[PDB]
């Protein structure tokens, strides 16, 4: 089903909706790592997952900062 690229129908029509899809996409990677690590009883996989959660947070903050300044750049008359 997803070979027809169904996930494109599931992503909204705003720049903020793309940002969320990136997080939900990466969330799948971390859940996959936690799954393998627990079955193998391997904590190295859990170190990887902890890094992925922390790195996925820094990516969100930078992306939102760019989006925020993108928004105020239009609303930059400020001649009052």
């Amino acid at each position: 089903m997803d070979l027809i690229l169904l996930m494109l129908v599931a992503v909204g029509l705003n720049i903020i909706d793309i940002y969320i899809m990136i997080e939900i996409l990466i969330m799948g990677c971390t859940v996959n790592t936690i799954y393998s690590a627990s079955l193998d009883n391997d904590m190295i996989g859990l170190i990887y997952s902890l890094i992925q959660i922390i790195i996925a947070g820094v990516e969100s903050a930078i992306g939102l900062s760019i989006l925020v300044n993108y928004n105020r750049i239009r609303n930059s008359e400020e001649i009052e």
């Binding site: 089903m1 997803d2 169904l6 129908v9 599931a10 909204g12 705003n14 903020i16 909706d17 940002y19 969320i20 997080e23 939900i24 969330m27 859940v31 936690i34 799954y35 690590a37 627990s38 009883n41 904590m43 190295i44 859990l46 170190i47 997952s49 902890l50 890094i51 959660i53 922390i54 790195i55 947070g57 820094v58 969100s60 903050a61 930078i62 939102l64 900062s65 760019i66 989006l67 925020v68 300044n69 928004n71």
Partner: protein, 155 residues
């Protein structure tokens, strides 16, 4: 009755029809909660709580924080159910049939008399074995603090 399927079908229904950014942020929260709950049971209770503390408590309320800043402005029932049903049919992520139909166990042993939580071992290795990974992370965090201020600060 693995009810975790029904939560995502509702979630998969509203992802196809969301229009504004209020519903788009709702899909985020509606996805972490099944992720947290399916981690609390089964696999890892430690990373279910780390996700709540780090995703919901830190990165999710930032989205709604900037949505109030950005703006708030501005299909057919047959095709949706047809798509969702088609999406519903084939849900086998892997094609190793024996790996998905045959169950396994582990044998416990008493050789580990120093029993401590996973977060004890993760800290044991992150602060000793992979102290470079930990130190680069604080370096990536440092760049963000500088990176946020240069992007956003006006003067």
């Amino acid at each position: 009755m693995n009810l975790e399927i029904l939560d995502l079908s509702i979630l998969g229904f509203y992802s196809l029809i969301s229009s504004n950014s209020f519903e788009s942020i709702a899909i985020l929260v509606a996805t972490i909660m099944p992720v947290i709950t399916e981690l609390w049971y089964n696999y890892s209770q430690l990373f279910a709580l780390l996700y709540t503390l780090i995703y919901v408590g830190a990165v999710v309320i930032l989205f709604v924080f900037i949505l109030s800043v950005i703006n708030e402005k501005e299909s057919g029932l047959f095709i949706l159910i047809l798509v969702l049903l088609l999406d519903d049919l084939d849900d086998n992520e892997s094609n190793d049939n024996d790996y998905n139909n045959v169950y396994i166990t582990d044998y416990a042993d008493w050789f580990n008399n120093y029993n401590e939580s996973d977060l004890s071992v993760i800290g044991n290795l992150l602060f000793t074995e992979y102290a470079l990974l930990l130190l680069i992370i604080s370096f990536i965090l440092l760049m963000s603090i500088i990176g946020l201020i240069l992007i956003v600060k006006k003067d």
